[PDB]
Amino acid sequence: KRSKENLPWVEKYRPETLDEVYGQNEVITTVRKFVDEGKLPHLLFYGPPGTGKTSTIVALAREIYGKNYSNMVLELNASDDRGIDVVRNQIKDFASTRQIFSKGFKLIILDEADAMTNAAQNALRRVIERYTKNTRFCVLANYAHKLTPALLSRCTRFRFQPLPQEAIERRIANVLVHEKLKLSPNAEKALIELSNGDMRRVLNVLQSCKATLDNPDEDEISDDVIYECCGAPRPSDLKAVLKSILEDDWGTAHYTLNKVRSAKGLALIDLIEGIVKILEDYELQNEETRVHLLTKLADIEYSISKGGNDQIQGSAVIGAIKASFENETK
Amino acid sequence: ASMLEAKFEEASLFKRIIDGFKDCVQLVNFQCKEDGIIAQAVDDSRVLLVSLEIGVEAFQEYRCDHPVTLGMDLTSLSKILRCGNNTDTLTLIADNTPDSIILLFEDTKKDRIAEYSLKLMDIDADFLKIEELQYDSTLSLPSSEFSKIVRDLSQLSDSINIMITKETIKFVADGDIGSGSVIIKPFVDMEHPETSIKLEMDQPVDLTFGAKYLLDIIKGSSLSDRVGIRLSSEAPALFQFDLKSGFLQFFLAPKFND
Amino acid sequence: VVREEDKLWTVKYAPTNLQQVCGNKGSVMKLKNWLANWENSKKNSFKHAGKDGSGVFRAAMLYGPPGIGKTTAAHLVAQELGYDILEQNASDVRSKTLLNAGVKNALDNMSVVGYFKHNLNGKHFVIIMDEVDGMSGGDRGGVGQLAQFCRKTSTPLILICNERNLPKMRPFDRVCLDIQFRRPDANSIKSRLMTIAIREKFKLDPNVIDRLIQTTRGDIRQVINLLSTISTTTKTINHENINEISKAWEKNIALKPFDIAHKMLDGQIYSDIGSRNFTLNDKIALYFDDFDFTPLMIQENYLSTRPSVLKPGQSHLEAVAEAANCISLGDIVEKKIRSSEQLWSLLPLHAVLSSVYPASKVAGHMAGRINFTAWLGQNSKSAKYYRLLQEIHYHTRLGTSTDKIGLRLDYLPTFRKRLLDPFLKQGADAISSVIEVMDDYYLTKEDWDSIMEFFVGPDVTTAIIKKIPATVKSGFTRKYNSMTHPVAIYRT
Amino acid sequence: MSLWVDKYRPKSLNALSHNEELTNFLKSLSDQPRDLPHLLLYGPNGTGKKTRCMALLESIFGPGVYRLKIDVRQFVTASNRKLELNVVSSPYHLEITPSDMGNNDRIVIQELLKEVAQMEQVDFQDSKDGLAHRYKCVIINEANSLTKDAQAALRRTMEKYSKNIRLIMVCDSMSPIIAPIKSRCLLIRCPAPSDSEISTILSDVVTNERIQLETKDILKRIAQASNGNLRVSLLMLESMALNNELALKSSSPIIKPDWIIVIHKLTRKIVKERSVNSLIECRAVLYDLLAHCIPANIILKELTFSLLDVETLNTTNKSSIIEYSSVFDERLSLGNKAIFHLEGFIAKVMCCLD
Amino acid sequence: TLSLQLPWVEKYRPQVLSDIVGNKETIDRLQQIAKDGNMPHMIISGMPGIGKTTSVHCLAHELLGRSYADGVLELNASDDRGIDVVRNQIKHFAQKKLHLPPGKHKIVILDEADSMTAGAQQALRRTMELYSNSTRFAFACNQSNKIIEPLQSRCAILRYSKLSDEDVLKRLLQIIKLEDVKYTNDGLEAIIFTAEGDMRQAINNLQSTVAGHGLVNADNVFKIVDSPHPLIVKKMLLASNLEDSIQILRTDLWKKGYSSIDIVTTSFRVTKNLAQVKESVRLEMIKEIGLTHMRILEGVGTYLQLASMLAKIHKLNN
DNA sequence: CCCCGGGGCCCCCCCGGC
DNA sequence: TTTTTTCGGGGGGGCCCCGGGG
Ligand SMILES: Nc1ncnc2c1ncn2[C@@H]1O[C@H](COP(=O)(O)OP(=O)(O)OP(O)(O)=S)[C@@H](O)[C@H]1O
Ligand SMILES: Nc1ncnc2c1ncn2[C@@H]1O[C@H](COP(=O)(O)OP(=O)(O)OP(O)(O)=S)[C@@H](O)[C@H]1O
Ligand SMILES: Nc1ncnc2c1ncn2[C@@H]1O[C@H](COP(=O)(O)OP(=O)(O)OP(O)(O)=S)[C@@H](O)[C@H]1O
Ligand SMILES: Nc1nc2c(ncn2[C@@H]2O[C@H](COP(=O)(O)OP(=O)(O)O)[C@@H](O)[C@H]2O)c(=O)[nH]1
Ligand SMILES: [Mg+2]
Ligand SMILES: [Mg+2]
Ligand SMILES: [Mg+2]
């Protein structure tokens, strides 16, 4: 904990103010409007991993209370005990008592509330209803099916979308400026493609790419560096494998798959996922082809998830694709 | 045993100080500097703030080269302090960039040495200035009477209401089985100036506090024979126990009146 | 002091005499006769059973559905005979310690209030432990203590419960005289309902009373409550509001395992109109009424129906096979649920796989009587035999080279020819040799007996062993007991 | 006296009489036992895997390995459930069967084995090389029955404390063993003895026990009926000798186990009658078999192979039967209630036959 | 800003039974009970946010007048309601001596009673029976099945139904007139459609829309309240071509940040409540959905699994 | 120096979906 | 017309033993 430069990039680049949260303009604008006019309701933030929920709520707490927000809000997460007794005693005491420092309202942040038991959620209902005049609740979740309907009825919901491309590009530009790094356009495209809308993945991969350069001061990060550090297949490899499967005999396809995998030690799961993404754009005459492709590839993925024999699984992928595409003729 | 060396001539004083607020907070940062030791902690419910100060007059010897922050779990510290006899001097020892604090109990008459080490913890707490406020009412009364009143009223209700009016202090509790009200008035006896009740009022006040927090606070009565209560509307209630050199303060937030 | 107009009708019209209680006349008479002859049985040490057979039980156990009048009947029978009542309920603490402290000291103690009030029986205690079904707990819950006291008590004891067919009530299997209270007939309650309607000044059609009684499922208290709530505003209970009143006050009652099995296996609900009326959600809720036994009942009773939902060209056997396949899938899902991951969110899916789908594939008309699941007893028997096999295997470990399964499948058939057959062939002269073998493998007489039960099919030893002359078995026992034997596991 | 299967069990590597190549490999392993890795012996049941393991232990340490005692160990679960474990111990090795604790087998791995693993040997057990033995051997019987969590717990225990203990596991099949465990063990195949070797062993037992034999063909028939299981062949020989007054004739029939006879009767009934009532009676028979400690997997295998030996069935019926047997054997592997899967298999077979 | 605006669900909480919309017969019965007296033991069950707690509190207030503080004991899930509490505190309150008007009784309001344990409910039986001359019990719950039958036998059952769109519109218009809220018909229609009969949700959504954008129109309402994903799932499952269903999955659910577990659970529920389709087809689809749900629970929460589930459902429906 | 009140573990018993 | 498996949470009974008072 010497300096901020000894931290992982995911934590080192955590937004400190609402102005640094990207890709959530609608939610940020709405919550800022609520806070400015003192019309903050009970909030629920539902979204996938690494979209800015915790960052946004902490930034909102800073906006409301200032630099000393930590002593003016009650933050509980999955790493803490949040049983029914905790709800009855600690949350109830915090919600029904005035602030020690200031004279403002009180904020309770139940991060990862989807991990809370049903009994505690039920106990929270009357606590929320009874102390609304002076207390507000913020719930954060990735899975809404774990939240009781009663709790959902009492909260205003905001959905955090997967981060758009433009927000990721702007944050990457900021990180490159801070770190004195060069990123090629194709490298940025590949990084955004592999991120799948998660900023944490982008930051971790960028840190690994920087660590992979011999001389980061002048060396530039190319798509080759990204693929090498992440150990992911290149688009050319996927295209070649798919072409061999769809246009060559069994021996040639098997040899091509083995050679492509052994060239860089690729994983079969990555090849399957990339081929599925490519095939999703194909215009197929017969629906049976798509049905068989999806079912067989899902079965192969599930089997791979439990281990098994890699060679048999690869041959199964080849055979499944060939058999499914055999239906396009008639 | 180079940077920080602070010797309590009596090892029981530090044990009493820790016991005064060990049931209120668990993780506490002790800041030691040339003019003594300070500490501030906030309860998990964030309703009570504990502030401890010990000056250099409270130590037989005290030496601190640079300010040092020691994060401790009060349960472990109390466990360690319970292993020392009442007739042994207690030395607190810490070095540069410390990961531990050494507590050394010495009995020169018996030539007995007992050294314990307690691992420090990383606490991200910044000392929050307790800005002084001009309180509407300020009173002082013996700690034993306040403890008795609080314990008696806690049997009836979980909330105790304190009303300060001209020449009168009233503690009221209302509960399922019944209600109770204790009324005291400022009284001075020159013969024994330790049972006196002193009050200075500027604006009458009425504030309700949780009974459990008052029960925790009254545990500091073992440190001082008197307790000072400062109350003011729209501000936390201050309960102060005075030590020989320093003090122990509790800031308790009142309950919302709604 | 309390105005009679501010009292609930259930209190105003409570039965003040034993002849005022409607229904279950036989059970009330049985209880009266048992309690009136308690002293006579005591003089005979509760040994000489009487004409009714209620002479060997020192405590009565009244049980039935809610709202029939068990508590009132027990209280009235207690007062009529002049006894003093010591009543306890779930509102009081009745754990092991509290039971041993308070009620244990009253089972053979005189009543001080009885002494001061004064019949020859007014100084004795009739303990009435109501709501025993609510005594949550196992050994420390006090249920075992009450069962023990039912075996030892100097004064009459009455226990009242609702669901006697409960595992927690097992300790009371045979300790008390059972007395059944059943849903009273409509005719018995009609007189009281008419009287109450007349006194309360509202219009009640005599015919509507039958429908009202059907709605409450023989719950007189609920009938009176419904009458009160309806008469609050609507004082004209005509035939134009029967349906609304019945549907507004239809108690939601969880069905019992036999009823669940009967309803789930009915073919009407799986028809188009039946499905429209009784939806899939209703079937899943029916499963959830008792999710621990419903799959077991379905598995037990899905091969004993005449289907009415067979597809054109499908035979009964094919539907049975499909149901069995889905039952296997449901079993796999159940294993997934009750694992370290605790995947209880799959409970609804289980409902479909274990009960609803197989039932829908063979739903029809029952070809017999719904039978209780036989898997539980079979599982207990298997556990017992596996424990016996483990004991035998670890007695013979030093001599054999195999696992317990190998011992069962290979060793035991050969052990029989050296342990049982020589007795059948040689007779008494086979004693010593057998013991010799028993000594080489650290076998005990109990091990011999246990081994002689594992065999099945053509090698069952029950009749064969039973046919051995008693002299040979006596000689075997005596010779075994008259010699020292080795020990394998000498725990210290 | 002791059964002939136990009385004549070899006690040394040089006393083995079948699978000479395996004997040579084991002798090579025991030549320099200081760096011996963890061993996993896999093979058909009743072949001599435990006998060979004990012989290898005797070669490494000495005859004292056969001085076996039985102790009892206590275990406590998270719910304060007291569990007893029977441990077979020797001055040089321990024997444990964690499957006896069922789902609690993990505890045995987490506490007992670990406790032995952490404890360094301080007994001066001078070896052939002149230096005292350094590690203590632990045998895990029925290792294929261990739960996946116990196998996972075994990994770092094997890796970290290899200097203090060495594991010998014995299994009928390696399919239930997780890949990390197989990676951590030296795998040793234990082939079943040939018919000639079984006949030689049986003839040796016959001449040692002075049993009248009309011809040597009876031993060959016994070996053939045993299907390569030496324990079964020896026990069958003893049973036949007892049943014929220690005088085996060429017409003496092969004695079959009671459960085998019941399964054959069930197969005949299934082939003859295919209806719901027949299914109910089959369920009754299956319950009877399961109640008396007949494993479900054994029942399924025996039923499948008995059905496949029926002469009236055609190729399509047999193919369907084997397919259903595979599917329902997987279901049994992934299930709890075995009767459910067995009934499903029987119903599917009944449907296919019609 | 340290100020807080009072939520309209609290500012406009009904204070008398006359201000409660919906369930006209039940509210009329409660009004008659309040006017006359002799309140019986009652259990009120219904779905969230329809006016059960409001009804109970209004009844107690109007029945007890100034004696509300002394004659009402309110316990909810946020309080301790164990066996000790039932055996001591509730019993003491029932035995308490309190002079009341000629036809009034003390009231114990056990809100969210469906969360109470079986032991406490069993203990309540004799307390209710013995002291019925001075105390009466009111239960409010979401699931009446959780209440043990012995308690149900002693109580009067008053079941509440979902509020119709007319009642919701009436209450919303009243609140709008009180608050001077600018609105359009489409905005109110969208609010009512998204509320789904939950008055609390409708009021909260209206207040949030007014705070965030001022004008309550369709655009702003949808900008605040998202389209219910169950309807999207229902559209996905009833699509004719597999391509359309896959497109819906990829665009309206997967790219909107909905987790695979949520999607599969919603699909299961929607298929269960799909009365338009034959029951056997629904059972087959439920089997496939359960397979996919188990796979997701094992950790394979990929879009390919959902696509395969959709393909299998399409095959079944063919 | 001895008895009583009340905090803290220890042990066991039952649920788990909409 | 009768009666089973596992974590985790919650509840509830039972001591145990420190502290404080007399
Ligand atoms: N909108 C964002 N803008 C900038 N960085 C972001 C953003 N979202 C996530 N990150 C980055 O990823 C890190 C984690 O962000 P979080 O706010 O913790 O996401 P999250 O949605 O709360 O994750 P979960 O729900 O606990 S898995 C931040 O410190 C940032 O560095
Ligand atoms: N047989 C009955 N005859 C007349 N009234 C009855 C009868 N049974 C019940 N009631 C009425 O309902 C009220 C309660 O009767 P109870 O004696 O408590 O029945 P119960 O079977 O003991 O109920 P449980 O098992 O404790 S829920 C009586 O005061 C009567 O008003
Ligand atoms: N019938 C109604 N009439 C007017 N307002 C209502 C009505 N129902 C709900 N509300 C409003 O929504 C708010 C909450 O109503 P509640 O009475 O708490 O619903 P509820 O049935 O108790 O919900 P649950 O079951 O506790 S989650 C009230 O303060 C009212 O402002
Ligand atoms: N004569 C002889 N008998 C053997 C040999 N190997 C095994 N056996 C016999 O076969 C019996 C069963 O062998 P066992 O070790 O239990 O096989 P496992 O079940 O695979 O471990 C033993 O009791 C031995 O008597 C061998 O090499 N020579
Ligand atoms: Mg987060
Ligand atoms: Mg009763
Ligand atoms: Mg409510």
Short mmCIF file of N, CA, C and O in Angstrom, two decimals, chain A residues 33-36 38-39 46 88 92 105 123 125-126 129 132 136 143-145 153-157 159 162 280 287 290-291 295 298-299 301-302, chain E residues 1-5 10 78-79 112 142 198 200-201 208 211-212 226 242-243 250 255-256 258-259 261-262 295 298 300 302-303 305 308 314:
data_model
loop_
_atom_site.label_atom_id
_atom_site.label_comp_id
_atom_site.label_asym_id
_atom_site.label_seq_id
_atom_site.Cartn_x
_atom_site.Cartn_y
_atom_site.Cartn_z
N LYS A 33 -29.46 14.19 -11.57
CA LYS A 33 -30.64 15.04 -11.46
C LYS A 33 -31.38 14.80 -10.15
O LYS A 33 -31.82 15.74 -9.49
N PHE A 34 -31.53 13.53 -9.77
CA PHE A 34 -32.20 13.22 -8.51
C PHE A 34 -31.46 13.84 -7.33
O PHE A 34 -32.08 14.43 -6.43
N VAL A 35 -30.14 13.72 -7.32
CA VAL A 35 -29.35 14.21 -6.19
C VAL A 35 -29.37 15.73 -6.13
O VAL A 35 -29.42 16.32 -5.05
N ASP A 36 -29.33 16.39 -7.29
CA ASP A 36 -29.22 17.85 -7.31
C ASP A 36 -30.42 18.51 -6.65
O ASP A 36 -30.27 19.48 -5.90
N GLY A 38 -32.54 17.02 -4.53
CA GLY A 38 -32.95 16.34 -3.32
C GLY A 38 -34.17 15.47 -3.50
O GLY A 38 -35.07 15.47 -2.65
N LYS A 39 -34.22 14.71 -4.60
CA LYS A 39 -35.33 13.82 -4.90
C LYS A 39 -34.82 12.40 -5.12
O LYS A 39 -35.25 11.71 -6.05
N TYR A 46 -29.13 -2.95 -11.34
CA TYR A 46 -29.05 -4.31 -11.84
C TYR A 46 -28.17 -4.33 -13.09
O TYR A 46 -28.41 -3.56 -14.02
N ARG A 88 -32.06 -6.65 11.86
CA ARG A 88 -32.86 -6.19 12.99
C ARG A 88 -32.11 -5.18 13.85
O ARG A 88 -32.72 -4.23 14.35
N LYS A 92 -31.25 -1.37 11.40
CA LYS A 92 -32.34 -0.65 12.05
C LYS A 92 -31.81 0.52 12.88
O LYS A 92 -32.38 1.62 12.85
N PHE A 105 -29.51 13.34 5.30
CA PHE A 105 -30.13 12.03 5.32
C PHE A 105 -29.06 10.95 5.35
O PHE A 105 -27.86 11.21 5.25
N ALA A 123 -37.27 -9.10 6.21
CA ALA A 123 -37.15 -8.20 7.36
C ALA A 123 -36.85 -6.78 6.93
O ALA A 123 -37.23 -5.82 7.62
N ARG A 125 -38.16 -5.09 4.58
CA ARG A 125 -39.28 -4.38 3.96
C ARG A 125 -39.80 -3.27 4.86
O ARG A 125 -39.91 -2.11 4.45
N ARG A 126 -40.12 -3.60 6.12
CA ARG A 126 -40.68 -2.60 7.01
C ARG A 126 -39.63 -1.62 7.49
O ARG A 126 -39.96 -0.48 7.83
N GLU A 129 -39.73 0.84 4.64
CA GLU A 129 -40.95 1.63 4.63
C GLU A 129 -41.01 2.61 5.79
O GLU A 129 -41.46 3.75 5.63
N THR A 132 -38.36 5.95 5.70
CA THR A 132 -38.14 6.61 4.42
C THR A 132 -37.91 8.11 4.58
O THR A 132 -37.23 8.72 3.76
N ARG A 136 -32.37 6.33 2.95
CA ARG A 136 -32.52 5.79 1.61
C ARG A 136 -31.68 4.52 1.49
O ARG A 136 -30.64 4.39 2.13
N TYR A 143 -28.09 -10.69 -10.50
CA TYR A 143 -29.16 -11.65 -10.78
C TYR A 143 -30.42 -11.20 -10.06
O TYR A 143 -30.49 -11.27 -8.83
N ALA A 144 -31.41 -10.74 -10.82
CA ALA A 144 -32.64 -10.24 -10.23
C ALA A 144 -33.54 -11.34 -9.68
O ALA A 144 -34.39 -11.06 -8.84
N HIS A 145 -33.37 -12.58 -10.14
CA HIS A 145 -34.22 -13.67 -9.69
C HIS A 145 -34.00 -14.02 -8.22
O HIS A 145 -34.82 -14.75 -7.65
N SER A 153 -40.64 -4.19 -5.36
CA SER A 153 -41.73 -3.23 -5.42
C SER A 153 -41.36 -1.90 -4.79
O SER A 153 -41.91 -0.86 -5.16
N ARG A 154 -40.42 -1.90 -3.84
CA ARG A 154 -40.09 -0.71 -3.07
C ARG A 154 -38.94 0.10 -3.66
O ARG A 154 -38.59 1.14 -3.09
N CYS A 155 -38.35 -0.33 -4.77
CA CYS A 155 -37.16 0.30 -5.32
C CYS A 155 -37.38 0.72 -6.76
O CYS A 155 -38.15 0.10 -7.50
N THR A 156 -36.71 1.80 -7.15
CA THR A 156 -36.67 2.24 -8.54
C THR A 156 -35.46 1.62 -9.22
O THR A 156 -34.34 1.74 -8.72
N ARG A 157 -35.69 0.96 -10.34
CA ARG A 157 -34.69 0.10 -10.97
C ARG A 157 -33.95 0.84 -12.08
O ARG A 157 -34.55 1.56 -12.87
N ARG A 159 -30.92 -0.21 -15.00
CA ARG A 159 -30.20 -1.30 -15.63
C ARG A 159 -28.90 -0.78 -16.21
O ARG A 159 -28.91 0.16 -17.02
N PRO A 162 -24.19 -3.50 -20.83
CA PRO A 162 -22.79 -3.77 -21.17
C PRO A 162 -22.17 -2.55 -21.82
O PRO A 162 -22.80 -1.85 -22.62
N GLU A 280 -22.86 -17.71 -36.77
CA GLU A 280 -24.09 -16.99 -36.48
C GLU A 280 -24.48 -16.02 -37.58
O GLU A 280 -25.66 -15.69 -37.72
N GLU A 287 -33.49 -24.60 -41.64
CA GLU A 287 -33.41 -24.35 -40.21
C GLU A 287 -32.84 -25.56 -39.46
O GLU A 287 -32.25 -25.40 -38.38
N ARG A 290 -29.16 -25.13 -38.61
CA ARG A 290 -28.88 -24.32 -37.43
C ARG A 290 -29.25 -25.07 -36.15
O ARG A 290 -28.52 -25.00 -35.15
N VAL A 291 -30.37 -25.78 -36.16
CA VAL A 291 -30.79 -26.51 -34.97
C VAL A 291 -29.73 -27.52 -34.57
O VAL A 291 -29.30 -27.58 -33.40
N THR A 295 -27.40 -27.45 -31.13
CA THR A 295 -27.54 -28.51 -30.14
C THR A 295 -26.23 -29.27 -29.96
O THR A 295 -25.77 -29.48 -28.83
N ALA A 298 -23.48 -27.09 -28.34
CA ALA A 298 -23.75 -26.92 -26.92
C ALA A 298 -23.40 -28.18 -26.14
O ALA A 298 -22.83 -28.10 -25.04
N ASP A 299 -23.74 -29.35 -26.68
CA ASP A 299 -23.37 -30.60 -26.02
C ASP A 299 -21.86 -30.73 -25.90
O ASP A 299 -21.34 -31.13 -24.85
N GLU A 301 -19.64 -28.30 -25.84
CA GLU A 301 -19.17 -27.33 -24.86
C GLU A 301 -19.40 -27.83 -23.44
O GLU A 301 -18.52 -27.73 -22.58
N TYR A 302 -20.59 -28.39 -23.18
CA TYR A 302 -20.86 -28.92 -21.85
C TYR A 302 -19.92 -30.06 -21.51
O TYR A 302 -19.42 -30.15 -20.38
N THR E 1 -26.66 17.54 -2.20
CA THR E 1 -27.81 18.05 -1.47
C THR E 1 -28.24 17.07 -0.39
O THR E 1 -28.41 15.87 -0.65
N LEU E 2 -28.40 17.58 0.83
CA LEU E 2 -28.72 16.76 1.99
C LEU E 2 -30.22 16.68 2.27
O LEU E 2 -30.63 16.03 3.24
N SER E 3 -31.05 17.31 1.44
CA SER E 3 -32.49 17.27 1.61
C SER E 3 -33.08 16.03 0.93
O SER E 3 -32.50 15.46 0.00
N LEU E 4 -34.24 15.61 1.43
CA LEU E 4 -34.96 14.47 0.88
C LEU E 4 -36.42 14.84 0.69
O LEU E 4 -37.05 15.38 1.61
N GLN E 5 -36.96 14.55 -0.49
CA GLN E 5 -38.37 14.76 -0.76
C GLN E 5 -39.15 13.53 -0.31
O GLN E 5 -38.77 12.40 -0.63
N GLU E 10 -45.77 7.57 0.75
CA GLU E 10 -45.93 7.92 2.15
C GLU E 10 -46.73 9.20 2.33
O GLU E 10 -47.57 9.29 3.23
N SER E 78 -39.46 -7.10 10.71
CA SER E 78 -38.30 -6.38 11.21
C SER E 78 -38.15 -6.47 12.72
O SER E 78 -37.10 -6.09 13.25
N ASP E 79 -39.16 -6.96 13.43
CA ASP E 79 -39.10 -7.14 14.87
C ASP E 79 -38.87 -8.61 15.21
O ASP E 79 -38.94 -9.50 14.36
N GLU E 112 -46.92 -9.25 7.90
CA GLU E 112 -46.07 -10.24 7.26
C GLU E 112 -45.99 -11.51 8.10
O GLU E 112 -44.92 -12.07 8.35
N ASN E 142 -48.63 -12.41 2.48
CA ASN E 142 -48.68 -12.58 1.03
C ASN E 142 -49.11 -13.98 0.64
O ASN E 142 -49.77 -14.15 -0.40
N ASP E 198 -49.81 -3.11 -9.20
CA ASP E 198 -49.12 -2.76 -7.96
C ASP E 198 -49.17 -1.25 -7.80
O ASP E 198 -48.48 -0.51 -8.51
N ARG E 200 -48.13 0.67 -5.32
CA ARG E 200 -46.87 1.26 -4.86
C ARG E 200 -45.90 1.44 -6.02
O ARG E 200 -45.26 2.48 -6.14
N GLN E 201 -45.80 0.42 -6.88
CA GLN E 201 -44.92 0.53 -8.04
C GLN E 201 -45.37 1.65 -8.97
O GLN E 201 -44.54 2.42 -9.47
N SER E 208 -40.83 9.07 -9.88
CA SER E 208 -39.51 9.05 -10.50
C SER E 208 -39.52 9.71 -11.87
O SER E 208 -38.59 10.45 -12.21
N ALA E 211 -39.74 13.48 -11.39
CA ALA E 211 -38.46 14.02 -10.93
C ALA E 211 -37.41 14.03 -12.04
O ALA E 211 -36.64 14.99 -12.15
N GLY E 212 -37.36 12.97 -12.85
CA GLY E 212 -36.31 12.84 -13.85
C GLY E 212 -36.54 13.64 -15.11
O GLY E 212 -35.58 14.13 -15.72
N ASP E 226 -38.29 0.18 -17.42
CA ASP E 226 -37.94 -0.68 -18.54
C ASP E 226 -39.10 -1.60 -18.90
O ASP E 226 -39.97 -1.90 -18.08
N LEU E 242 -37.22 -20.02 -35.76
CA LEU E 242 -36.12 -20.04 -34.80
C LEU E 242 -35.22 -18.83 -34.96
O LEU E 242 -34.64 -18.35 -33.98
N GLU E 243 -35.08 -18.31 -36.18
CA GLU E 243 -34.25 -17.14 -36.41
C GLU E 243 -34.79 -15.93 -35.64
O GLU E 243 -34.02 -15.17 -35.05
N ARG E 250 -30.72 -12.43 -28.75
CA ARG E 250 -29.44 -11.75 -28.89
C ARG E 250 -29.57 -10.24 -28.72
O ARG E 250 -28.64 -9.61 -28.20
N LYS E 255 -27.88 -8.72 -25.08
CA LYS E 255 -27.13 -7.48 -25.21
C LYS E 255 -27.62 -6.39 -24.27
O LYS E 255 -26.99 -5.33 -24.19
N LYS E 256 -28.73 -6.61 -23.57
CA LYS E 256 -29.24 -5.65 -22.59
C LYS E 256 -28.69 -5.89 -21.19
O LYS E 256 -29.04 -5.15 -20.27
N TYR E 258 -28.94 -8.88 -19.36
CA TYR E 258 -29.66 -9.86 -18.57
C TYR E 258 -28.85 -11.14 -18.45
O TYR E 258 -28.34 -11.65 -19.46
N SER E 259 -28.73 -11.66 -17.23
CA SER E 259 -27.95 -12.86 -17.01
C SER E 259 -28.69 -14.09 -17.55
O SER E 259 -29.91 -14.11 -17.68
N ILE E 261 -29.03 -16.97 -16.09
CA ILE E 261 -29.86 -17.58 -15.05
C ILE E 261 -31.22 -16.89 -14.99
O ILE E 261 -32.27 -17.55 -14.90
N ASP E 262 -31.23 -15.56 -15.04
CA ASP E 262 -32.50 -14.83 -15.04
C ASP E 262 -33.34 -15.20 -16.25
O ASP E 262 -34.55 -15.42 -16.14
N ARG E 295 -27.56 -27.03 -16.60
CA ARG E 295 -26.27 -26.75 -17.22
C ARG E 295 -25.74 -25.38 -16.79
O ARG E 295 -24.56 -25.24 -16.48
N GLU E 298 -24.43 -25.44 -13.31
CA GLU E 298 -23.11 -26.06 -13.26
C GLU E 298 -22.00 -25.11 -13.68
O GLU E 298 -20.82 -25.45 -13.52
N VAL E 300 -21.93 -23.31 -16.91
CA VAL E 300 -21.88 -23.01 -18.35
C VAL E 300 -23.04 -22.06 -18.63
O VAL E 300 -24.11 -22.44 -19.11
N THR E 302 -23.46 -19.68 -20.97
CA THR E 302 -23.12 -19.06 -22.24
C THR E 302 -24.37 -18.83 -23.08
O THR E 302 -25.44 -19.40 -22.83
N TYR E 303 -24.22 -17.97 -24.08
CA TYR E 303 -25.32 -17.70 -25.01
C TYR E 303 -25.60 -18.91 -25.90
O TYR E 303 -26.73 -19.09 -26.36
N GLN E 305 -25.71 -22.02 -24.96
CA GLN E 305 -26.66 -22.89 -24.27
C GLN E 305 -28.09 -22.40 -24.45
O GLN E 305 -29.00 -23.20 -24.70
N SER E 308 -29.21 -23.15 -27.96
CA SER E 308 -29.55 -24.57 -28.09
C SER E 308 -30.90 -24.87 -27.46
O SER E 308 -31.69 -25.66 -28.00
N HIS E 314 -37.99 -25.06 -30.44
CA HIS E 314 -38.53 -24.93 -31.79
C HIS E 314 -38.78 -26.30 -32.40
O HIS E 314 -39.80 -26.52 -33.06
#
